[PDB]
Design a protein around this ligand. Structure first.
Ligand SMILES: Nc1ncnc2c1ncn2[C@@H]1O[C@H](COP(=O)(O)OP(=O)(O)OP(=O)(O)O)[C@@H](O)[C@H]1O
Ligand SMILES: [Mg+2]
Ligand SMILES: [Zn+2]
Lengths: 189, 566, 222, 594
């Protein structure tokens, strides 16, 4: 009908990316917009862009930041959590606690991919090390997800600190299996 | 008018000022469909315009007729037009029926200059420049490499005095000097990619990808015009030195990119085939050993035996060849190649590597691109063939990207197959002694070969012509003579005649070798066509390549022999 | 209560996500959508005015990209709503046919949705009447019979499992747990269970039990 | 010391390799572990690219380095799958030059080599030891041994007083793996001048077992080692990777192996409105004319559908074709092409055949003195096509052995105390000449055919090809042959051999159409008409040599079902019935009327 079948009940990865790019990010403007034309946006705030000074930290939307970066008019400041030391600490936390998930940002995977593809020279640390750390974190979380999938039941279920992309990936299977279990239990009564 | 070497930045700024508006596109680029140098130059320009967010259209073109058609089909919103790889020799104003009055926008009496809605930029390496485009016309802008100021002052004065005008004697002298200037042949003086890189350096947008494209464009000329490559090599060396990181101690990473000046060899696809194949399917090796008969094969086997490389090891592919022999190859060549006269195989080339991927040299990359251009995959059939070639242009364009490596591998395989086919055709030509020798020139006509279809493309015919020129002609101590190569297609019943300039022995620095040899066949062909009546086609950009009807070749060759203007 | 364009965009995104992940058809935000359409019209006029008249090139690109993003969001939301209306035409018609029901399609749908619903229902009814229904006896000539062997009216799956993220008030229902964190308590009548939802925690709950919290905006579907 | 460094290097290669943004081997290992596939396939080009020193070490001493690689793979798998599993197998892929099987000699001892051949025999799976639990007879000392299957190991000679060899293996606590033996012959085209084909012994372990069937060309990557059965060693090959052009897994199982990209290529091809013409043109492109025989060969390759009734009766679903014609008709070339294109096929000469050759043979084992059954062309070509050239040359005795195979699709053996019923579901394509070498129209058909009616009735379609001297056809054939001698459409008018073979396999494993009532009515009417015509055509002097029985009705049904299967159509309509009837009239009734 109006909506395709693959877009029903779930978001496509492009939709998840679109949702992610609405979040703020820190940049270093390479031009001086502030006065001592004017952005007039209706979805986000335009005060930050107008009051932008060279080599001064400012906050804008991620998609606007990428658009500026394409023109080489701003250097994206990578998130603090995307450092080698912080990723190592998160890996250690994951290893020490086999029952919970590390408190990573809900958009860590999507943001990491976007920044690796678009902003490669902005990172202070080598890109390959960050890729390896992210891969290891992903495998550990996959092991935890597989272990936790054994407790599906007709009642609720809790998955704390799980990111948005992982939830999007797992939504079909988990939802359908739990729905069928609930249907069987309801029929039993 | 023309722009000097330092005016490239001004021309680029003019293009930015005029043809830049996000509302609609106002920039169109016309590209020669069968020129690797033009392909690389247009790729560099496309990346540069993408950086600045300039809306543009890229249209491959084959021949002057298609240029006229496409220009007639152009819209009125095109402020600037780019002619990359052609247009230098012909009169664009006269050819394109461009009348400046119909193209003007505003005229200022005080300024003395007129503004025109459309502008045309010519990036042509061929010579001689057409003085109408350089000194007469204002709409046509030419990207000169300094030739006009270096050597065309006297012709400039003569043309200006002709325009400004007992006087009959002065007019006679000026028109005589103009005719003498116009009487010379055509050659290539510089690489367009070099000029684009000079522009980028002027505006400071030079990086490693641009340098790689410049290297490819420059080395595309090595096969034919080695003097240009030798002149431009030191600058490429210096630029590679400048752009390379000082420290290489860091271990390889998946994203590491290397660009080294390593010893290259005059061998065919050494790194993507076997050593035996590399020596076998090389123009220089075959020329210096005559590998088209059994004696050449015996000599090659004897050479390989004296180098200490087993025949089984030599035929092994490059990747899996024994590492000891691969490491010693440089020394082995240093001590053994001199005996068999292959001392020229030693050379320095550019090799590019990506992290955890194979390493490919510039010559091999150019060979793959040319193979993709050639075999990648009455008037109606001709149009369909030219459409197929235009389509192949885009496969070649895609191969230039680092993400599309499968296309590069396919091009390498097609290059191997094409070289094998050309070798077979050359063996057939030489065994049959089909190369007739007339005092003025040599002649070779293909009529009943096994692979006649492959030679409808001008590039494949030029490849075969180069193979034949290097073999048994560059050697033998025979006086240099231009060669005529013709092929036949039954599906259309017409010929593809291609004149080829002679070449001095490769790698023989001499005063006479320093001087170039011009290609005079365009003038003779045009004169014969105008005088005769045979419905010949001179629509190809390379004026030396024409299409001749089946019946008229014999009279055409008779007139060519009797003309004596070759 | 209008606040600012940013809040309107945030509410539009929340509504889009909830509609995409919700089993039922949620009420239409009439005022918010009217404001958004008017703002889009004014912004398009402003962009045209600026364009008609090089430092100003980047801002214009930003305006155009933002307009495209907002248009895409609204388009996806409306198309999802139309698909849901397609899947629940008979349900609704039954809602309207009942007078004791509190809900009315005028509040539950926009005018365009009402027109689309009526037109599609009429067209499909004409097709099925000219094809199949006219041959069956009078007893089987009703497209919506609830007394048959299988009910023909497809109601929403009330107990569908959905992902939620507890955010709390932008609270009488709020209470603290043993560990000192704010929490919500909901019941599952079928299983006679009590589930404690902790603020900031992701859960996979049944839609029916979380319906009130979702409507009050205390939780949001992921 | 050095072993630990080698293991660390292999682990780093596994955990660090990447060509764009996917860690190929890490993800591959995780995916393999997910489906309980404890192995890892490594492309040697990637290993060379990552670090040439590792490749040099691997090539220098494969038998000592590969186990370290397996240990590294196991450690990485444990890291990636278990949140704090037998030894994993390493399978190699390479593009190095293939060494002829006969060129393998002393110079290639203990080296990784690539070669191709034909599998002629496979053994029964055996059991090897990996983890052994042992105990001493006297002091009862418990000990364990870990064994790798790469041979340059034994029970300790001295206990840890106890006599020599004091340890006895405890079986219930040990772990074993699977092992198989294969015999690889050299390709017929690669054999030297005037030499018999050479055999080579090969071994495979764990996940490389049950991968090949006898009679299929394969490419093998392995180590050229030697084992002492006194100054000599018996050569053998330790298989490290098997690459074949036939999906053996999908042939012996109802399971079908085809990538999603394949499945969707074969659906698009089936959607072509004129696939029949493409396949007809794709068979024997170098042979002029013979369109009807090419269509018959297409039908034979596709085959019909087999039905098993509730009462147990089974109906044949294979199509047999006979070619009786004059010399120079290109029958043998068609047979060779059929053998080349079919997924499974055996080319045999009637002259050079026997009863025991073509069914199964009782063979006594030299050692055990026990009788076993080997297999012949109709067991080796099970599920395929048997091309019996020179059909006429075959002795009566030999010939008579084929009837049950053709009709009942089984082989019954009662010899040397062996009572069994083998399975031979094959299609027979035979070529033969008349009694006098040409079909003399002066003599009656009965005098031109020495075949008894019993054998002829089993052939679904019989083609009597007569060479007629027509100037136009002669000139056309001469031009075609001259062009062939002196001399690639691939524009949708023809598909290569590999694609056709894959499509044949897919169609056979996917579709089994059925006749519609209209098809049945039309077929019954045509059968009645044909039988009435045959009865009318009879002459008092002789009875029809070419028979028309219920088998011909079954053959026509099979042809219709094969035509329907050609397009992946679940149902066969009158459109296919018409083509089947036309083919039958063009071949069998054409032969009978004469
Ligand atoms: N129509 C044809 N097109 C191409 N080649 C043909 C054709 N007819 C015959 N030939 C050639 O004629 C030769 C006949 O040999 P072939 O073994 O194929 O004959 P045959 O029909 O099996 O006869 P025989 O009964 O004598 O064994 C082959 O080389 C075949 O290539
Ligand atoms: Mg024969
Ligand atoms: Zn003991």
């Amino acid at each position: 009908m109006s909506l395709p079948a693959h877009l029903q009940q779930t978001f496509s990865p492009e939709e998840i990316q679109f949702i992610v790019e609405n979040e703020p990010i820190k940049i270093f403007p390479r031009i001086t917009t502030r006065q001592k034309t004017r952005w007039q946006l209706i979805t986000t705030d335009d005060k930050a862009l107008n009051n932008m000074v060279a080599m001064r930290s400012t906050e804008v939307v991620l998609w606007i930041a990428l658009l500026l970066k394409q023109q080489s008019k701003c250097s994206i400041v990578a998130p603090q959590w995307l450092t080698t030391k912080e990723l190592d600490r998160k890996i250690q936390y994951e290893k020490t606690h086999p029952d919970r998930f590390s408190e990573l940002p809900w958009n860590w995977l999507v943001l990491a991919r976007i920044l690796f593809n678009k902003a490669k020279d902005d990172f202070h640390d080598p890109i390959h090390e960050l890729r390896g750390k992210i891969q290891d974190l992903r495998e550990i979380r996959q092991i935890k997800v597989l272990k936790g999938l054994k407790y599906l039941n007709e009642s609720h279920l809790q998955l704390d600190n799980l990111s948005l992309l992982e939830i999007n990936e797992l939504r079909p299977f988990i939802t359908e299996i739990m729905d069928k279990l609930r249907e069987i239990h309801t029929a039993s009564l | 008018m023309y722009y000097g070497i330092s005016q490239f930045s001004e021309a680029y700024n003019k293009i930015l000022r005029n043809s830049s508006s996000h509302s609609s596109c106002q920039l169109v680029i016309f590209v020669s469909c069968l020129n690797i140098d033009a392909l690389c130059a247009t790729k560099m320009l496309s990346l540069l315009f993408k950086k600045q967010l300039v809306q543009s259209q890229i249209v491959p073109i084959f021949g002057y007729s298609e240029l006229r058609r496409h220009y007639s089909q152009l819209d009125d919103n095109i402020n600037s037009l780019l002619l990359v790889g052609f247009g230098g020799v012909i009169d664009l104003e006269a050819f394109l029926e461009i009348d400046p009055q119909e193209y003007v926008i505003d005229t200022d009496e005080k300024s003395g200059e007129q503004s025109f809605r459309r502008d045309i930029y010519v990036l042509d390496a061929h010579r001689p420049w057409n003085l109408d485009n350089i000194f007469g016309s204002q709409i046509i802008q030419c990207f000169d490499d300094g030739t006009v100021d270096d050597t065309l002052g006297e012709q400039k004065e003569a043309y200006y005095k002709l325009l400004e005008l007992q006087r009959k004697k002065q007019i006679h002298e000026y028109e005589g000097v103009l005719e003498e200037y116009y009487s010379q042949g055509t050659t290539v003086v510089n690489s367009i990619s070099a000029q684009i890189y000079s522009l980028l350096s002027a505006i400071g947008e030079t990086n490693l990808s641009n340098l790689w494209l410049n290297i490819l464009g420059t080395t595309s000329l090595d096969i034919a015009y080695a003097q240009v490559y030798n002149r431009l090599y030191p600058l490429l060396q210096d630029e590679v030195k400048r752009l390379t990181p000082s420290s290489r101690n860091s271990v390889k990473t998946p994203d590491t990119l290397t660009l080294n000046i390593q010893p290259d060899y005059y061998l065919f696809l050494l790194r993507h085939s076997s050593l035996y194949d590399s020596f076998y399917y090389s123009n220089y090796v075959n020329a210096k050993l005559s590998l088209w008969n059994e004696n050449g094969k015996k000599r090659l086997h004897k050479m390989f035996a004296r180098m200490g490389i087993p025949l089984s090891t030599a035929q092994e592919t490059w990747l899996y060849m024994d590492h000891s022999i691969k490491r010693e190859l440089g020394i082995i060549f240093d001590k053994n190649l001199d005996r068999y006269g292959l001392q020229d195989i030693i050379r320095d080339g550019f090799v590019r590597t990506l992290g955890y991927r194979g390493s490919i040299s510039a010559s091999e990359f150019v060979e793959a691109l040319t193979a993709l251009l050639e075999v990648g995959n009455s008037a109606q059939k001709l149009t369909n063939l030219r459409k197929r070639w235009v389509s192949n242009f885009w496969l070649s364009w895609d191969a230039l990207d680092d993400r599309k490596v499968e296309l590069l591998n396919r091009g390498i395989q097609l290059a191997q197959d094409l070289q094998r086919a050309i070798f077979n055709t050359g063996v057939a030509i030489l065994e049959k002694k089909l190369i007739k020798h007339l005092r003025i020139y040599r002649l070779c006509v293909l009529q009943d070969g096994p692979d006649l279809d492959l030679y409808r493309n001008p590039l494949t015919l030029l490849r075969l012509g180069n193979w034949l020129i290097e073999c048994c002609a560059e050697s033998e101590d025979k006086q240099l003579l231009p060669m005529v190569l013709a092929s036949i297609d039954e599906n259309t019943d017409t010929y593809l005649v291609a004149g080829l300039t002679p070449r001095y022995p490769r790698g023989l620095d001499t005063i006479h070798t320093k001087k170039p040899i011009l290609n005079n066949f365009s003038m003779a062909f045009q004169q014969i066509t105008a005088e005769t009546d045979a419905k010949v086609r001179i629509d190809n950009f390379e004026s030396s390549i024409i299409e001749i009807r089946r019946e008229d070749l014999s009279p055409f060759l008779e007139k060519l022999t009797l003309s004596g203007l070759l | 209560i209008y606040v600012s364009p940013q809040q309107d965009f945030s509410d539009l995104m929340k509504s889009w996500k909830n509609e995409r992940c919700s089993p039922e058809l949620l009420p239409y935000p009439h005022q918010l959508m009217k404001r958004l359409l008017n703002r889009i019209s004014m912004q398009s006029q402003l962009i045209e005015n600026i364009s008609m008249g090089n430092e100003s090139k980047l801002p214009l690109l930003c305006m155009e990209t933002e307009l495209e993003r907002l248009k895409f969001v609204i388009r996806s939301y409306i198309r999802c709503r139309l698909s849901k209306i397609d899947k629940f035409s008979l349900y609704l018609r039954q809602l309207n046919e009942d007078e004791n029901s509190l809900i009315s399609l005028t509040d539950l749908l926009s005018k365009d949705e009402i027109k689309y619903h009526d037109t599609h229902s009429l067209i499909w009814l004409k097709l099925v009447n000219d094809s199949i229904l006219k041959y069956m006896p009078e007893e089987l000539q009703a497209i919506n019979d609830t007394e048959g062997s299988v009910n023909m009216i497809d109601e929403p799956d009330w107990n569908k499992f959905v992902f939620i993220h507890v955010n709390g008030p932008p609270d009488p229902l709020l209470q603290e747990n043993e560990f000192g964190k704010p929490c919500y308590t909901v019941t599952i009548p079928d299983l006679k269970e009590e589930v404690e939802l902790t603020i900031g925690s992701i859960y996979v709950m049944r839609y029916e039990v979380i319906r009130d919290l979702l409507r009050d905006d205390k939780v949001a579907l992921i | 010391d050095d072993n630990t460094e080698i293991i660390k290097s292999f682990k780093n290669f596994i955990l660090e390799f990447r060509l764009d943004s996917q860690f190929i081997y890490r993800d591959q290992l995780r995916n393999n572990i997910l489906v309980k596939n404890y192995s890892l396939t490594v492309n040697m080009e990637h290993l060379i690219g990552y670090n040439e020193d590792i490749y040099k070490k691997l090539s220098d001493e494969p038998s000592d380095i590969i186990p370290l690689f397996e240990t590294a793979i196991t450690q990485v798998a444990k890291r990636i799958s278990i949140l704090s599993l037998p030894t994993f197998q390493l399978i190699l892929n390479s593009n190095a030059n293939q060494i002829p099987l006969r060129d393998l000699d002393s110079e290639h001892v203990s080296k990784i080599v690539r070669l191709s051949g034909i599998i002629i025999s496979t053994s029964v799976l055996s059991s090897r030891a990996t983890y052994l639990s042992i105990m001493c007879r006297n002091c009862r000392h418990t000990t364990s041994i870990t064994i790798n299957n790469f041979n340059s190991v034994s029970l300790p000679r001295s206990c840890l007083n106890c006599g020599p060899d004091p340890y006895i293996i405890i079986h219930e606590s040990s772990k074993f793996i699977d092992q198989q033996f294969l015999k690889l012959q050299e390709i017929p085209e690669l054999v030297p001048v005037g030499e018999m084909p050479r055999n080579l012994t090969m071994t495979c372990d764990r996940y490389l077992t049950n991968k090949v069937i006898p009679g299929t060309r394969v490419t093998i990557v392995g180590i050229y080692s030697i084992y002492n059965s006194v100054a000599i060693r018996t050569p053998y090959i330790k298989i490290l990777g098997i690459q074949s052009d036939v999906e053996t897994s999908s042939i012996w199982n109802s399971v079908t192996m085809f990538t999603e990209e394949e499945e969707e290529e074969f659906l698009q091809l089936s959607r072509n409105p004129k696939l029949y013409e493409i396949l007809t043109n794709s068979i024997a492109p170098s042979i002029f004319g013979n369109e009807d025989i090419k269509k018959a060969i297409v039908c034979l390759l596709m085959g019909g559908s087999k039905k098993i009734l509730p009462d147990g009766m089974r109906l044949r679903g294979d199509i047999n074709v006979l070619l009786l014609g004059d010399p120079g008709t290109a029958k043998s070339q068609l047979l060779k092409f059929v053998e080349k294109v079919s997924p499974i096929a055996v080319y045999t000469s009637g002259k050079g055949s026997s009863a025991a050759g073509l069914t199964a043979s009782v063979q006594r084992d030299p050692m055990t003195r026990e009788f076993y059954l080997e297999g012949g062309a109709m067991v080796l070509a099970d599920g395929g096509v048997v091309c019996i050239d020179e059909f006429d040359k075959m002795r009566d005795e030999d010939r008579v052995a084929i009837h049950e195979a053709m009709e009942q699709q089984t082989i019954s053996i009662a010899k040397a105390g062996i009572t069994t019923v083998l399975n031979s579901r094959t299609s027979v394509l035979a070529a033969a000449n008349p009694i006098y070498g040409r079909y003399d129209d002066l003599k009656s058909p009965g005098d031109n055919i020495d075949f008894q009616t019993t054998i002829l009735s089993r052939f679904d379609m019989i083609f009597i090809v007569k060479d007629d001297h027509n100037e136009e056809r002669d000139i056309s054939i001469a031009n075609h042959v001259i062009n062939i001698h002196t001399g690639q459409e691939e524009n949708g008018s023809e598909i290569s051999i590999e694609k056709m073979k894959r499509y044949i396999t897919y169609c056979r494993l996917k579709c089994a159409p059925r006749l519609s009532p209209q098809a049945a009515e039309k077929l019954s009417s045509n059968f009645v008409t044909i039988r009435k015509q045959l009865l009318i055509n009879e002459e008092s002097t002789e009875r029809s040599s070419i028979p028309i029985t219920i088998r011909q009705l079954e053959a026509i049904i099979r042809i219709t079902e094969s035509l329907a299967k050609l397009e992946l159509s679940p149902i066969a309509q009158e459109r296919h019935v018409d083509e089947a009837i036309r083919l039958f009239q063009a071949s069998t009734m054409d032969a009978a009327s004469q």
